Amino acid sequence: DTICIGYHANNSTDTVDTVLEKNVTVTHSVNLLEDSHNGKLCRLKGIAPLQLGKCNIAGWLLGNPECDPLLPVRSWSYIVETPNSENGICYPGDFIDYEELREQLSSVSSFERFEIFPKESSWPNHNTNGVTAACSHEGKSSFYRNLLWLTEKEGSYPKLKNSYVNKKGKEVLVLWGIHHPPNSKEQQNLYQNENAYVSVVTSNYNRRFTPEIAERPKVRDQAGRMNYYWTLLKPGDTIIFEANGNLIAPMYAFALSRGFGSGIITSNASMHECNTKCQTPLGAINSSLPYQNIHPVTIGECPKYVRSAKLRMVTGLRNIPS
Amino acid sequence: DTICIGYHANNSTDTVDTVLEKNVTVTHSVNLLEDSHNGKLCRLKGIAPLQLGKCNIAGWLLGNPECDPLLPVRSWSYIVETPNSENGICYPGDFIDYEELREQLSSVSSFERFEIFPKESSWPNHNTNGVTAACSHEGKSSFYRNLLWLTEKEGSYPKLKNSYVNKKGKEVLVLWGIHHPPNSKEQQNLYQNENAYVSVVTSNYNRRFTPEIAERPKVRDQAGRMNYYWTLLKPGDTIIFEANGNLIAPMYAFALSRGFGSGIITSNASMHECNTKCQTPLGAINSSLPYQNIHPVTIGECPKYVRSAKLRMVTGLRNIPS
Amino acid sequence: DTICIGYHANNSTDTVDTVLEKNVTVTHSVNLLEDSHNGKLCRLKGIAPLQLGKCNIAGWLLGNPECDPLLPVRSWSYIVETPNSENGICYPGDFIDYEELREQLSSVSSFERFEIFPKESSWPNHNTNGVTAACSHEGKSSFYRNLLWLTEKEGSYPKLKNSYVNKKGKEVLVLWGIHHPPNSKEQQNLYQNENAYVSVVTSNYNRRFTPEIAERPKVRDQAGRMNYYWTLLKPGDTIIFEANGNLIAPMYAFALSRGFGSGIITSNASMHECNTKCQTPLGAINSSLPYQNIHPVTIGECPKYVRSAKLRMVTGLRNIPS
Amino acid sequence: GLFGAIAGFIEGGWTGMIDGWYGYHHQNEQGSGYAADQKSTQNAINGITNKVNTVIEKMNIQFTAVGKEFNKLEKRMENLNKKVDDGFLDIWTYNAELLVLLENERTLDFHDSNVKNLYEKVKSQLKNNAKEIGNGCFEFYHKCDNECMESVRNGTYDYPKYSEESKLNRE
Amino acid sequence: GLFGAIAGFIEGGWTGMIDGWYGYHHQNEQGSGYAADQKSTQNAINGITNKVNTVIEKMNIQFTAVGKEFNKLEKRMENLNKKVDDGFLDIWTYNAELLVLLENERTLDFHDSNVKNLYEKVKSQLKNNAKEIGNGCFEFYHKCDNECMESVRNGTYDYPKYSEESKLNRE
Amino acid sequence: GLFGAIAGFIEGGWTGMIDGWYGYHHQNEQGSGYAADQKSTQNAINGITNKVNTVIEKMNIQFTAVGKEFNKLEKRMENLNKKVDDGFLDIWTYNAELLVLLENERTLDFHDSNVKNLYEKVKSQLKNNAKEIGNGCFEFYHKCDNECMESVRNGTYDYPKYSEESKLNRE
Ligand SMILES: O=C(c1ccc(N=[S@](=O)(F)N2Cc3cccnc3C2)cc1Cl)N1CCO[C@@H](c2ccccc2)C1
Ligand SMILES: O=C(c1ccc(N=[S@](=O)(F)N2Cc3cccnc3C2)cc1Cl)N1CCO[C@@H](c2ccccc2)C1
Ligand SMILES: O=C(c1ccc(N=[S@](=O)(F)N2Cc3cccnc3C2)cc1Cl)N1CCO[C@@H](c2ccccc2)C1
Ligand SMILES: *[C@@H]1O[C@H](CO)[C@@H](O[C@@H]2O[C@H](CO)[C@@H](O)[C@H](O)[C@H]2NC(C)=O)[C@H](O)[C@H]1NC(C)=O
Ligand SMILES: *[C@@H]1O[C@H](CO)[C@@H](O[C@@H]2O[C@H](CO)[C@@H](O)[C@H](O)[C@H]2NC(C)=O)[C@H](O)[C@H]1NC(C)=O
Ligand SMILES: *[C@@H]1O[C@H](CO)[C@@H](O[C@@H]2O[C@H](CO)[C@@H](O)[C@H](O)[C@H]2NC(C)=O)[C@H](O)[C@H]1NC(C)=O
Ligand SMILES: *[C@@H]1O[C@H](CO)[C@@H](O)[C@H](O)[C@H]1NC(C)=O
Ligand SMILES: *[C@@H]1O[C@H](CO)[C@@H](O)[C@H](O)[C@H]1NC(C)=O
Ligand SMILES: *[C@@H]1O[C@H](CO)[C@@H](O)[C@H](O)[C@H]1NC(C)=O
Ligand SMILES: *[C@@H]1O[C@H](CO)[C@@H](O)[C@H](O)[C@H]1NC(C)=O
Ligand SMILES: *[C@@H]1O[C@H](CO)[C@@H](O)[C@H](O)[C@H]1NC(C)=O
Ligand SMILES: *[C@@H]1O[C@H](CO)[C@@H](O)[C@H](O)[C@H]1NC(C)=O
């Protein structure tokens, strides 16, 4: 009679690397590197993302007419722009502190779009009809839905002064614009005052704008320029507009709510009826795995992104079915 | 007769974790994670900190009257603001490049507060009595101790020009202010010149200031605004002030010495008669331990902060008194 | 008869450290920490660096006369300034966004210096002869080679307007300057228009410059100042200059090509007829070693810099020739 | 095989043994069969399960981490942001890869340890009442049965019972 | 116990042995007593003391490290600064925790090594002049004394002196 | 010596043995000579060569990494940039230094493993046909030759051939 001590083997084809060796075949092992996603945009912890569609943050907040109008109130877990950012700024110029506003929006959980200065009542003795071929809609000249081009009425541009008090109990994002004509004749025609100014003031914002007249190269057929400005009006605070020309007045503004764990991503992927704890621009991950090589851009509670092709840890022993 | 080889055990209750196991009881071990501090602000390597008390860097450097006056000369190992930053800017407006000045102060080891432009001699043909209820002291209207509100005298604000040469052999921090009245009548009353300007120049600083007149919302009962500016005047260099209105003139300035290993912290804790190599906002650490979980904010020579609850390394063996 | 199993020893004096011990003498070992370089500036992957010599990026791009003129066209793998940055800005003032332009140059692989606005034709009815003792060449008053000091001609400074179209198929770096006289008399003499302005415009650049007149402290014997500005004119785009005074006009500009893996370093070292995959400010490294303690500043494909004095890994066994 | 047992003096594994990593093969008058040592095997599972859990627990959840945008004149801050993102990623990839490599080496060596320790335990239990006959096998100098085999596997083997018989047999 | 000695074939420690981690228990006509092997123990202290010092030396002093402030329009630089502070802290916590875990495993295994090596040294010294009687104990086939016990503990044990006597006794 | 072989019961190395890390010394009627075990040695070279390659492969090429410049009013971004450069460098120095220390310990222990495993392989092969005579040497109870020595070194040693002769000799 004989008695023997020995160890398990099986049909396992799993391989791992060690420091001393590699392509070591082992009885049992566990994958730590998640490489599988579902290729869909999904709800995050029950809340759908904001899809800007043919629009970029700039087009959306200014209200570029080519962009399909969103609901007056929305909430989201994250913001999706598309690689095809076709509709942004339509009238050429600079969006001042644009990157800072995007960073501000990264921590915003919802908005109410509301009529801050009603078109009919807010601007007596000025024309509000101003449109441009640079901001086209269905072939017709149009303008931003959230701004208003104030021009002369019956040969006069009276000095205007209007203020709004924030009784929304939320930060209110107000945007406006300053128009810079290419020459002194257009300035005269639109605003009459050759030496016009614009002032915008709050408790913690104070800025004066003076037009800069010059023949510039044509951009979307305009030699003129429009600079775009914004501020966050604190709850209870007042914003005051004074102008004797060149003001692209606010009409609609946004009451913002702040939330946690949001961001802006760019994605080719489509919204599906799904829910996830972890979203990437490529698709959602459903994993208790510690690492992933799918994408460095993550929303939610995700594995740590690494460049690795494989991370496999051995649990069994050297498999030798000999 | 029998002879046996065996190993030490004792009454030790110390536990450690390993990769394979945890709550392993061991004969001897050493704690590497310092979690004990004395809950006091202490001198650092013999040198006391600067306690701003009811003041913040802004209140201190402008000389907010509500803040108890410091000595004319001080040295420190680090700067302490309190969570109760009650006295800062007293007259509303912007402190331009405020964060950059704080960063500059983080490497400053001492100052001399000195009379850069003596109140009596420096400003002929202007009133220097200007005070405001926004900068109250014991219920009476007052003003910043280090600035001077120049206004009209006998219906005239003569164009002024004054310069100071830095013969201190140190960088000299000069602060000043620009006042922005809410309306054209107040501008007229205070400075007479409706189109006033201020200029400040050195070898490497050149800036012109023009007032911006507008009705702003009241802040501490003021519709007006005051912007605050600063520069570091190099040793041997000259600063020149020109103004025909709106200048809040420097009176006192600071000769700065630079040092090593300083910073600004916010702390609830009290100064005690103690000395340390390592200070945190919570208290001082007296440790040769490599790690600490007390606070991420450190002054001096400290253990590396980590989030760990325990870091205990085994030195003895598995304790089995069986 | 006896048979024995044993292990190699030799004359090796190599020592390594372990966790449990140190100064352990071993039979065989390999050095992982590269500490040897050749103390030369070398070509990188076949391409020579740009040596600015007595010049700094500022002196080079403005064309400080004291700097020996480079070829009209050059390519490089990296840029070398010397510690002796003796010739930079020659006429005192600010180089606006100077650090950003250096960062832009870090990714530039070549330039063509070309006559953007020919001296003879481009500026009718203005003097172009303006020179200054601040920008001396061989003891004679001179000026930047790439800019032109436009002043009055026969008591008039006509309003000028000139534009250049980029047909180079590369980004074109255009530089220009704004002169700020110390007093109203010099302004009158040089430009006649007491209220002059300068405008510069492209499709994505728009800025107006107004002079700021004040007595400033002398710097290189000048109370006046000159501010220096730049932009990158996109391929196919147009730059337009308008001025009625104070413009330091572009004469020469640079067609820039972008490349990979470049940067700016400061080095005492001399160009030699050598070629490397890895360059440091101290010298070139020729190594398959993973780590180096020569310098943290690297161009090319280098070992990772560490502070270590030694990194030696044992391959053989404890050497015991006893 | 750091301890020379696995892929060493025991050249192969037993595919026939499906109920644990380590254990016993018996051959006697009554037949032959495999059986895992549950104590040494279960302890080995606990250890490895604690080691996998340790690696995962230490790698904490990544929270929302997204790109930032920078204008034409913020190339330095863009470059700085990239240096920070790239730098962290370089570090984490390296940390992850070495940790699995180091632990894998430690793991194989650990299984080798468990085989050597179980062999020595039974060998020292059986003592001179059987002979070591190579490839981790003992040949008995006496008759062994299901009771005998079960008593040896669970560490309850008696020497006096077979000491005289083996001695007569071993010569 | 990676080497199967500590919490293995030697089930417990000796609380009675207070003068070192490893050593000897003797029982003879003249009495019984414990004594640490100073050579193996002191070397073990040196190693562990060098390992603790290594961990501390590699963790360099932290110098002044304080918060920065950012205005309403510097949210990106504030966020970038946080990402850098958070990132470094994530890394250092992980590095610290694993290093103690890895070294602790290596430490216990190291003590297990020292016990196996000392047992084998004395066993191979005593050879067939005594029998291994379980739980890391030898039973002498001859009389042993304080001189005998002291000679064995410090590795100066003689075989010829007791070879004949043991052989007569061992039968 | 974690396994007590190197700088343990085999006190020294053989400077005379220049053709491998481990192997054999023979002394017989025909003379004496050294010879490396190529199988165990070559495998040891492969392992160590794979470990050095692993350390280097994981440390990826550094690409262009240069200073940035900041104006009088960008002290925070300059400080932030320094914190990032300093922070990464602190981390990489630490990672590099510990990795060589940990692997060096693992390396020495690995060589100790290879010596113990080769000794046990030959000892278990030779069995009771020779006696262990200390310092990792066996003294034969029978005559051994170049054929005998070559058969033992490459693991082809016969017991029956010398079993009777040794038994007569061993008494
Ligand atoms: O090797 C393993 C194994 C495989 C993976 C593992 N990892 S887990 O503990 F499940 N770890 C993996 C993971 C991933 C994600 C979340 N939680 C977890 C927990 C732990 C172990 Cl022992 N096994 C599973 C247990 O039984 C072992 C076995 C032994 C002998 C014969 C047949 C099977 C084989
Ligand atoms: O286990 C340890 C121990 C405990 C801590 C230690 N760490 S230190 O070398 F002191 N290290 C810890 C520390 C912290 C801060 C600054 N320097 C240092 C130096 C080193 C050792 Cl061997 N000891 C102390 C020495 O004696 C050991 C012992 C052995 C058997 C019986 C009774 C005691 C027990
Ligand atoms: O110890 C070593 C050794 C020394 C260095 C080494 N590292 S390398 O594999 F060459 N590694 C080092 C390096 C550096 C840079 C680029 N590639 C590489 C590859 C690997 C080994 Cl086995 N050797 C070389 C092989 O032979 C060993 C030996 C053994 C017994 C008697 C005489 C010599 C001694
Ligand atoms: C790792 O090793 C295995 C060896 O089993 C390789 O897999 C096989 O390779 C042999 C080559 O002759 C084929 O006959 C088998 O059909 C393969 N079997 C399976 C199931 O894959 C494998 O190629 C090696 N891989 C690497 C990366 O080295
Ligand atoms: C770690 O293990 C020890 C076991 O000794 C635990 O401590 C004791 O727990 C038992 C539970 O029945 C009590 O009877 C003892 O009074 C406890 N003694 C001491 C001195 O603490 C301990 O709870 C375990 N801890 C963890 C975190 O698992
Ligand atoms: C490391 O140990 C070696 C011991 O061999 C030291 O080197 C020698 O030191 C002795 C000191 O008495 C001299 O006699 C020898 O001439 C030295 N030989 C050589 C070749 O260096 C060495 O100093 C030790 N180093 C450290 C840092 O501890
Ligand atoms: C391996 O064995 C299992 C036994 O249950 C079998 O079901 C499986 O299909 C086999 N093959 C592979 C590749 O897993
Ligand atoms: C996610 O993966 C788990 C795997 O454990 C699976 O059971 C579950 O159905 C998957 N889907 C969701 C939404 O959890
Ligand atoms: C453990 O033993 C020591 C012996 O000196 C004793 O003083 C101590 O109080 C005991 N108890 C604890 C919990 O340390
Ligand atoms: C700090 O701790 C040490 C502990 O070694 C102690 O001796 C010393 O008195 C403490 N206080 C100071 C100020 O060093
Ligand atoms: C060591 O031995 C080699 C044998 O080839 C010899 O050439 C060498 O000079 C010796 N000395 C040193 C310090 O390497
Ligand atoms: C670089 O070092 C290698 C060492 O392998 C050497 O052969 C080569 O000649 C050196 N020079 C160059 C330019 O590669």
Short mmCIF file of C-alpha atoms in Angstrom, two decimals, chain A residues 115-267:
data_model
loop_
_atom_site.label_atom_id
_atom_site.label_comp_id
_atom_site.label_asym_id
_atom_site.label_seq_id
_atom_site.Cartn_x
_atom_site.Cartn_y
_atom_site.Cartn_z
CA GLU A 115 -38.22 85.96 -19.06
CA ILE A 116 -35.86 88.28 -17.10
CA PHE A 117 -36.76 91.36 -19.21
CA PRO A 118 -40.04 90.80 -21.14
CA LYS A 119 -39.62 91.85 -24.85
CA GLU A 120 -42.83 94.03 -25.04
CA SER A 121 -42.58 96.04 -21.71
CA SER A 122 -38.87 96.22 -20.75
CA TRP A 123 -37.44 98.51 -23.53
CA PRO A 124 -39.70 101.50 -24.33
CA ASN A 125 -38.51 103.87 -27.14
CA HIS A 126 -36.13 101.26 -28.72
CA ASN A 127 -36.59 98.83 -31.64
CA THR A 128 -36.28 95.10 -30.61
CA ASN A 129 -36.76 93.58 -34.13
CA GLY A 130 -32.98 93.43 -34.95
CA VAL A 131 -31.97 90.20 -36.80
CA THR A 132 -28.89 89.05 -38.81
CA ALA A 133 -28.07 86.51 -41.58
CA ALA A 134 -25.17 85.25 -39.36
CA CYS A 135 -27.88 83.78 -36.99
CA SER A 136 -30.06 82.17 -39.70
CA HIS A 137 -33.17 80.01 -38.98
CA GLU A 138 -34.85 78.06 -41.86
CA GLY A 139 -33.10 80.36 -44.37
CA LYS A 140 -34.61 83.54 -42.79
CA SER A 141 -32.38 86.06 -40.87
CA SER A 142 -32.98 85.61 -37.09
CA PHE A 143 -31.28 86.20 -33.69
CA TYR A 144 -30.42 84.49 -30.34
CA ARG A 145 -33.63 83.49 -28.48
CA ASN A 146 -32.26 84.70 -25.10
CA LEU A 147 -30.88 88.09 -26.23
CA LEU A 148 -32.50 91.13 -27.89
CA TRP A 149 -30.88 93.50 -30.42
CA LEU A 150 -31.91 97.01 -29.25
CA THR A 151 -31.55 99.65 -32.02
CA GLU A 152 -32.77 103.23 -32.69
CA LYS A 153 -36.54 103.89 -32.93
CA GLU A 154 -37.74 106.95 -34.98
CA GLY A 155 -34.11 108.24 -35.22
CA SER A 156 -33.52 108.20 -31.42
CA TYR A 157 -31.76 105.76 -29.03
CA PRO A 158 -32.78 107.13 -25.61
CA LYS A 159 -30.46 106.29 -22.70
CA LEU A 160 -32.03 103.18 -21.07
CA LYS A 161 -31.84 101.95 -17.46
CA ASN A 162 -33.45 98.67 -16.33
CA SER A 163 -32.88 96.45 -13.27
CA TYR A 164 -34.07 92.97 -12.21
CA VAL A 165 -34.19 91.72 -8.59
CA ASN A 166 -33.42 88.00 -8.05
CA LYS A 167 -36.42 86.65 -6.02
CA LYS A 168 -35.90 83.05 -7.40
CA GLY A 169 -33.98 81.82 -4.28
CA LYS A 170 -31.24 80.50 -6.69
CA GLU A 171 -28.19 82.04 -8.46
CA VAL A 172 -29.46 83.62 -11.70
CA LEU A 173 -27.15 83.40 -14.74
CA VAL A 174 -27.64 86.60 -16.83
CA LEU A 175 -26.00 86.87 -20.29
CA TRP A 176 -25.82 89.96 -22.54
CA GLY A 177 -23.80 91.21 -25.53
CA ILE A 178 -21.96 94.32 -26.78
CA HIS A 179 -22.08 95.07 -30.56
CA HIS A 180 -19.01 96.63 -32.25
CA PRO A 181 -19.95 98.08 -35.69
CA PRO A 182 -17.27 98.09 -38.41
CA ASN A 183 -17.60 101.88 -39.10
CA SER A 184 -18.91 105.21 -37.71
CA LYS A 185 -21.88 105.36 -40.21
CA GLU A 186 -23.41 102.02 -38.96
CA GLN A 187 -22.86 103.17 -35.29
CA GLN A 188 -24.78 106.41 -36.15
CA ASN A 189 -27.64 104.50 -37.94
CA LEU A 190 -28.16 101.85 -35.18
CA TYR A 191 -27.56 103.94 -31.97
CA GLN A 192 -27.26 107.69 -33.07
CA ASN A 193 -24.80 108.40 -30.16
CA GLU A 194 -21.25 108.26 -31.70
CA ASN A 195 -19.75 108.06 -28.11
CA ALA A 196 -22.09 105.37 -26.64
CA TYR A 197 -21.37 103.19 -23.54
CA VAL A 198 -22.96 100.20 -21.70
CA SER A 199 -22.80 99.63 -17.89
CA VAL A 200 -23.80 96.44 -16.00
CA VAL A 201 -23.72 96.41 -12.16
CA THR A 202 -24.52 94.12 -9.23
CA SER A 203 -23.29 94.01 -5.59
CA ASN A 204 -20.10 92.20 -6.80
CA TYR A 205 -20.05 92.91 -10.60
CA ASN A 206 -19.23 96.32 -12.13
CA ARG A 207 -18.16 96.74 -15.78
CA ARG A 208 -18.45 99.54 -18.41
CA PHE A 209 -18.32 98.62 -22.14
CA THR A 210 -17.34 101.15 -24.90
CA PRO A 211 -17.60 100.16 -28.60
CA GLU A 212 -14.42 99.75 -30.69
CA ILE A 213 -15.08 100.84 -34.32
CA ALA A 214 -12.84 99.35 -37.08
CA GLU A 215 -13.09 97.57 -40.45
CA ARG A 216 -12.40 93.93 -39.52
CA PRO A 217 -12.15 90.95 -41.90
CA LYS A 218 -15.56 89.33 -42.64
CA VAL A 219 -16.52 86.34 -40.40
CA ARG A 220 -19.88 84.67 -41.38
CA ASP A 221 -20.29 87.78 -43.68
CA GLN A 222 -19.94 90.27 -40.77
CA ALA A 223 -17.16 92.89 -40.45
CA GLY A 224 -18.82 93.83 -37.12
CA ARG A 225 -18.34 91.95 -33.84
CA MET A 226 -20.43 90.98 -30.82
CA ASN A 227 -18.79 90.28 -27.42
CA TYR A 228 -20.78 88.09 -24.99
CA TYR A 229 -20.66 88.55 -21.18
CA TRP A 230 -22.25 86.80 -18.19
CA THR A 231 -22.51 86.97 -14.39
CA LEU A 232 -24.15 84.95 -11.56
CA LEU A 233 -26.64 87.23 -9.76
CA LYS A 234 -26.74 86.07 -6.07
CA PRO A 235 -30.16 85.35 -4.51
CA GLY A 236 -31.77 88.68 -3.41
CA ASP A 237 -29.22 90.80 -5.41
CA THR A 238 -30.10 93.29 -8.24
CA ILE A 239 -28.59 93.62 -11.77
CA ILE A 240 -28.84 97.09 -13.45
CA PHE A 241 -28.35 97.76 -17.18
CA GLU A 242 -27.57 101.29 -18.41
CA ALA A 243 -26.84 101.91 -22.12
CA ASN A 244 -27.06 104.64 -24.77
CA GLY A 245 -26.11 102.13 -27.49
CA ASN A 246 -24.58 98.78 -28.47
CA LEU A 247 -26.32 96.70 -25.73
CA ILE A 248 -27.58 93.25 -26.75
CA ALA A 249 -30.05 93.05 -23.88
CA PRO A 250 -30.87 89.97 -21.81
CA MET A 251 -34.43 88.65 -22.45
CA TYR A 252 -34.27 85.11 -20.94
CA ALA A 253 -31.98 84.06 -18.04
CA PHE A 254 -31.46 80.80 -16.04
CA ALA A 255 -32.15 80.10 -12.34
CA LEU A 256 -29.35 77.58 -11.49
CA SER A 257 -29.40 74.79 -8.83
CA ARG A 258 -25.97 73.32 -7.78
CA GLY A 259 -25.34 69.56 -7.47
CA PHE A 260 -22.53 67.00 -6.93
CA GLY A 261 -20.54 64.69 -9.28
CA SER A 262 -21.55 66.29 -12.65
CA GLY A 263 -19.42 67.31 -15.64
CA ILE A 264 -19.44 68.00 -19.41
CA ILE A 265 -18.41 65.19 -21.83
CA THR A 266 -18.30 64.91 -25.67
CA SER A 267 -19.80 61.67 -27.04
#
